[PDB]
Amino acid sequence: THPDISVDVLVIGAGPTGLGAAKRLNQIDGPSWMIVDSNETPGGLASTDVTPEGFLYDVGGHVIFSHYKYFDDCLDEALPKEDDWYTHQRISYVRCQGQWVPYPFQNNISMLPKEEQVKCIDGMIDAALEARVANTKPKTFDEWIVRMMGTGIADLFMRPYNFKVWAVPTTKMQCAWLGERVAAPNLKAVTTNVILGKTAGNWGPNATFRFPARGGTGGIWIAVANTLPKEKTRFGEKGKVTKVNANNKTVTLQDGTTIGYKKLVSTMAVDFLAEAMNDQELVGLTKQLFYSSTHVIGVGVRGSRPERIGDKCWLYFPEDNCPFYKATIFSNYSPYNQPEASKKLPTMQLADGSRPQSTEAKEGPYWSIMLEVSESSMKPVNQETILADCIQGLVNTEMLKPTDEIVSTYHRRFDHGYPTPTLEREGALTQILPKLQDKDIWSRGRFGSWRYEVGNQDHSFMLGVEAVDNIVNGAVELTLNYPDFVNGRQNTERRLVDGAQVFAKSKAQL
């Protein structure tokens, strides 16, 4: 029997990855292609939400630092105007004992109490002395932390914070994933900074970043998707994949429409993929993979941006005085993330969780905060209380005075939030991925390929892109198999306009 539609390359999911695939496919204009999504709005986890009070909220506050000139070109195409972007300097801090410690924590010990400085420097001297002699490699994340920082920093920040974010102990995670993630503190420099009381907040890929002026990060992907031929796309309930038959290479959607593919590029969660395939081997294989759900909490609060907050972007909270691991001053990114000052809104509550002194709509201005709370089977959260706990933590961390008027509240739980880099991960993936590809299926993405090392927006985009480029031009998928390689360099070869396009354009010219 013949399928309703038949393409050479079928792309499932219109998130950054699938949009990357579609962008490269459309750039080449070679094989016939088609992209579907169960969501009427493209963007996936990189989309933006809006509260009834006019407050924008990303999925955990995203930031663009690209290793890819291609990604750069696509973004410059989607939003070409100068005033489409705001450029921001990275201002990051860590909350440790009533202090704001300049990121990276391990490099700013000088801003700690003396008693803790002692412990940290001690552990550092220990770890350094042993590292001078070591020959083996760290087995676990925890081991890597101890070797690179010391027990002082490990117990004061690393262990509790990393459990607070990853929802698993650092002893159950691997250590191959932190090439450009976790900085390795140098003893001499650290102690020098402890003596001189100076700082060093230059380390990190996020040195200087940019953010879309309007519509949040989702606007970027809507704008990108708008560069694609509308007829080659299928977003909404009409594009929801419900079945995948790999034996005869056909995908069945929600409405019943069947598509035939020669090559499949799937960016949905790989466990969902196996579940769709009805391949018990692959289901059982994927069920060895571990992830953590993400709770995104939004708070819109009345008043000018406090002096206490300043130009802070995002902050880490390793302590237990709050349920969230990271907060973001969203209002600092773009004035269009929150309502204008002339907008009148009623006070929902005070930061202490009591009635307002007035239930009338007052003017602004406003500012916005976005918190993230992790969940797993090792770290459950209570949904009905999590908002109140988040606000209460905002009080306890001196983010909000108990007199501060809360204008809006947001809360959304994402089942698949983080692809946990456990010890069993590669053991599962090196089986799952090659077996999918032998059925001509390229499963890529934050949950398609499950590798956090390369699970950022640009990374995903180029996962889709390189998947397609592999399928067509036999290119090697560097982004997928060599995270250190791609993250360690400036990828300037692949562009939105290639020699193929140029030469063909000059070919049809005559």
Added chain:
Amino acid sequence: THPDISVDVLVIGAGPTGLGAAKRLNQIDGPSWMIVDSNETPGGLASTDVTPEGFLYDVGGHVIFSHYKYFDDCLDEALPKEDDWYTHQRISYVRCQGQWVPYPFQNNISMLPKEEQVKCIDGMIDAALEARVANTKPKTFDEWIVRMMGTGIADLFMRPYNFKVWAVPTTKMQCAWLGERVAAPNLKAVTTNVILGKTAGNWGPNATFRFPARGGTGGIWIAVANTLPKEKTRFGEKGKVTKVNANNKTVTLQDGTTIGYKKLVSTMAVDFLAEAMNDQELVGLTKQLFYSSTHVIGVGVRGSRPERIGDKCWLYFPEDNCPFYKATIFSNYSPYNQPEASKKLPTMQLADGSRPQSTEAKEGPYWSIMLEVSESSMKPVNQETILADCIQGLVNTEMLKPTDEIVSTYHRRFDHGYPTPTLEREGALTQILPKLQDKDIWSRGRFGSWRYEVGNQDHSFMLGVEAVDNIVNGAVELTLNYPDFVNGRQNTERRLVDGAQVFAKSKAQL
């Protein structure tokens, strides 16, 4: 003024690199392309010469181990029949103090005299003890050798041999070039072999290889070049580039024909390239690069293959009893490298350089030997005596009895033999290569890009191929910039028939 010919991509040189470029170009069938060469026969340094007495000789006995399935595919295309190739197991030895020591030398100490065994194991223990404590990296090749093996093996083999081949001391070469070249010996295994008297000759990329049944390795490249459209090739005095004007992107040939290009893939020696451009900056820059001239000596000798030689493939000679650093029993590769048994040839001389007892044409059978002798400004040779010294060395190494009858003598001096991995090399290349590419000039190859690490046949072929793939598809030149990356893996992504070709073929089917 207009050029006589205009192409999008112009390829200079029909060696393995240029032919790689041409192969990928012709595969994609995108932009207009043209390949030229000053030689009527394609193959470059990978070609085959023949003596008037019917003996075949490569340029140093070229042996194939491919890291590239693309290279594999092109070869399988050029010579498709089963009987086009002969399969051989690697048999390699090192001549050390009247002994044949199985490659790798550093792992077969057991075949040495006891005193030297002691020296070697001593040096190895020292080096192993220091390595347990080392935190820095070796500055020079010499340092790398001492750290990895010890002064015993260093003085007994590594230093004198490496001078004998590289024509420069090991203290003037870098060490970043020897990933899969030099084997790092393990103390425990080495000593265990010294105890048991066993051998370990499985290390090396050459474990098993194949050789073209006829026409030497040059026949391979003729066969490859024959798969190209004849009209898009220009081989001979008509294809000799004498001028390169990068400012207006035009090349002028010997006959006067001018060819305009948009992109230039040049495989000629980079210093010759600068000389052709008349770019004094690039001339002065390239003249900082170092190379060694190579003498190829051939000796056809009467008689069946001696028991003493056996099924040996190639042999290394670190000592000073001979001027050559390597010999190759070329007759072992294919029975068509030398005349048939029934062929009658007069004896030229005995192995001791004396007159034969009979100058009449006698029957065979025959066997063949091919030597290589380095030359530089640090290691000058005398051409008028080098043949006699090579034969005399063949006697001194007990390769030939002084009674053996020499039937044929070959001798050729290639001015650009080896691109020397000096300390200043990268210092020059990181200037030269980017400046050329800014003039849209991809200078690739053994002397186009000057990197021995990746200067083999497959390596060169893929230098051209990936240069083109970069120009057209924006792929990254992994073979050029990341020799360890390409050498340490199995490159299976890029094939002679890609998804582009397949999908286009299915599109022209309807």
Added chain:
Amino acid sequence: THPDISVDVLVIGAGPTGLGAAKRLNQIDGPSWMIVDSNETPGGLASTDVTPEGFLYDVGGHVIFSHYKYFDDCLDEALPKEDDWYTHQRISYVRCQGQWVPYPFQNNISMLPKEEQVKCIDGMIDAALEARVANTKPKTFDEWIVRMMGTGIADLFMRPYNFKVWAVPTTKMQCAWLGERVAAPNLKAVTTNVILGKTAGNWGPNATFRFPARGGTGGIWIAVANTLPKEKTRFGEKGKVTKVNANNKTVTLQDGTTIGYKKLVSTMAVDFLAEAMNDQELVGLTKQLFYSSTHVIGVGVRGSRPERIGDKCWLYFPEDNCPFYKATIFSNYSPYNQPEASKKLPTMQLADGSRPQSTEAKEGPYWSIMLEVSESSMKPVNQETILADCIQGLVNTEMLKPTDEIVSTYHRRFDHGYPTPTLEREGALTQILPKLQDKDIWSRGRFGSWRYEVGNQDHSFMLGVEAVDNIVNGAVELTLNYPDFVNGRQNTERRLVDGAQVFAKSKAQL
């Protein structure tokens, strides 16, 4: 009430230690003194027994190597004649897999099977590599063995042998005791010896030793004791100490005679001493100390000394094919340890445990063998079978052919054989010894002070000597508290004739 006898210094036990005490006391001739013993013959554990068939047997074959010129002087006084001593070269071997491996075992790996040479050298390389980096110190004997030699030599010899002698696992013993006992293998020298098949049997304090011509080693202490005033000695049942009252400083003998002292030098087993004091604190403290019983076996066998034995002195047996840890060819020391050639003796049995072919008294000559078998609560023995098992071991080790005729059989069990250097030892001794000295009691000797490091004959002699010299001249007991100090030097200061004696003589001369 008054004591029957009153002396300034009382010496209990006429073993080497007590004899040392008595010798220094008698040299000084200062304070009044007296020495008692329960045995009519002085010598203690360094005495000789005789079988009814005329075979002499020490207590485990004793060998004299002196660290003390004083000990030397006393010996030269007791036996001054040239023919009172026989000089011998140390010929020692280890029985491992049908092989006689030259002592020290860990330095003569070359005389082992290849398969075991490999293991041993592997372990040595590992151990050397870790030792290059180590900064701590070994906790136990076992750890010391592993760090210094490797798991190869450890499992092949050190562990099984050291259990076979110490009657405790090497993990329960300390490592501070082996300064001049166990040799530390040098990797380079060892491997060089494995290469050249050479030997290294020069290590050890026992380089060239002497042995008393007549009466075994006991004759030395009889001869020494015969330089003491008979009236100041009390050997026999009359001299058996059965009570010690430290409060009023009185000693009650067997017959009831009471001896009052100002200072007490006790050489009996310290636990026995506590039991004699009826001091429960000291009994409890001493019961924490650990010792092993020693079984001494003797075999007189008919025939000339075989070629298979040669000039071997003592041999170690790490394997389990025999119950004994060491054997000694006693007949090699002196021709008087065994009956003369003309002596006629009946054959008791054959070496395989069967009746002789002839029960008549036949001529010789003869040779003698002495075996030692350890016993503890971790290594129980069966006395009724131990002799037969020892002979069987002599068969299994190719010491005795089953045809050999056994002329005499000796067996004696010494309850206190070895002062086991357990981990708890110093923990006990550093309490026991100072608490005894506060009661003016110097407990010295192999079981008086319980330190194997310094439990040799000369060591003991000088333990008594230095104890007295401390009591009289306030000399520091270096032999007791600094075993490494006294063992690592040539003690030439203290002589049998000192300046005091000289000047006193020259004073009485006028």
Added chain:
Amino acid sequence: THPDISVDVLVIGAGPTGLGAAKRLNQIDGPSWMIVDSNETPGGLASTDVTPEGFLYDVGGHVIFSHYKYFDDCLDEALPKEDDWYTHQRISYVRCQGQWVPYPFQNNISMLPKEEQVKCIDGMIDAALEARVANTKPKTFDEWIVRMMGTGIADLFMRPYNFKVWAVPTTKMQCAWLGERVAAPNLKAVTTNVILGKTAGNWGPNATFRFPARGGTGGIWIAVANTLPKEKTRFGEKGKVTKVNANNKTVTLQDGTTIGYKKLVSTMAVDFLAEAMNDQELVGLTKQLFYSSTHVIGVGVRGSRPERIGDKCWLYFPEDNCPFYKATIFSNYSPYNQPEASKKLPTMQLADGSRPQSTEAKEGPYWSIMLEVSESSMKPVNQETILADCIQGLVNTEMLKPTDEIVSTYHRRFDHGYPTPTLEREGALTQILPKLQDKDIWSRGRFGSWRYEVGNQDHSFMLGVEAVDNIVNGAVELTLNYPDFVNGRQNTERRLVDGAQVFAKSKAQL
């Protein structure tokens, strides 16, 4: 010919060493003995001088910390009353950049400027990291300093101070002497002190010490000498040894009197001894030794003890703002080192070097300061200026305000001040000392045996004591040959009343 006097043991020199010899000889009461000295007052370098204004001064402010219970006993005998001694807690500082840094300097980095704190901690980190890997031993004192501390502390304190005291560079001195002298800083504790701003002034043999109430330290040795039989002594011009004949064992004094000896204990400078013997070999050998002359400066100053001085005992001065390496607030030791308050004295000068405002004799109270200034051929001093320069340095170091009234001035040069522990020292001594003892001569003392390690008062006393105890009782001279052994322990064995004395007494009681 017969000598006018004949003794068994002759003791030259009535310093602490010779007095030790005399004390032990007189204790034993064995051989005949005699002690001579060219000085009518016993004490040697440990004597006290007095200025005409009634100010006492030792030879560099001597402080007693005893390793010897024997030394303790002799002192308790000489000055038995409780009020004969004053007890003081050690208060020591280092003058570095207008600061008082608590001893030891290397452990109190916290009290330094930040810029120098950084340098010091850096050097410490480097040195620690290298030390984790080091497998050799330091060759020179300088090397030891760098290894144990770092280039920071080395350049800031160690090098300049140690030159300022030893009068030779730290590169010319050996490192085998500093066991209990120089502290080895622990990086962790040091950095902890730097963080917390804490201190650590507990390290050092001089934790709590005592001082003779009257007559300085010389009073001690006079009091000791007064416990000897006067007839066996010979102090002054009569006891001046001018000639020594070793071949016939006789000594010729100043008056011509000859004394025959069987054993000689010389405590005079060994070079002077060789000069006295006219042994050219020994002179040539002794002149290979190196010493440094010591200048002692005294300043009596009017006024109550300033708050600026406090209860400071002695202070080190590494900088070049003064010529002296050490100062001692001698007035803090005893109120009897300086005149009583009611004493009336004129003012010699103001501390800035001008006339006083009043040349009339006013009252006190007073206080005293004693400086030490080294001299050699590498560090020459000017005698005529050295006093004024010392006072000027007292001004520059803010010890004396320029208004301070100087009451008295002392200045004495000691040709043999310090036995410099050079690299050639042991090379000379291991020849000189044994060759003297072969002529029955025991050269002991600060310049008799020339070893600073053990050149303190108690050390010297016990050098004589142990020399004699070796001559008589064959005791080992641990103090001479094993400085680490004696300094690292509590020597409690040898007492002023020994078992010989007790037993002999009790024997003469009956």
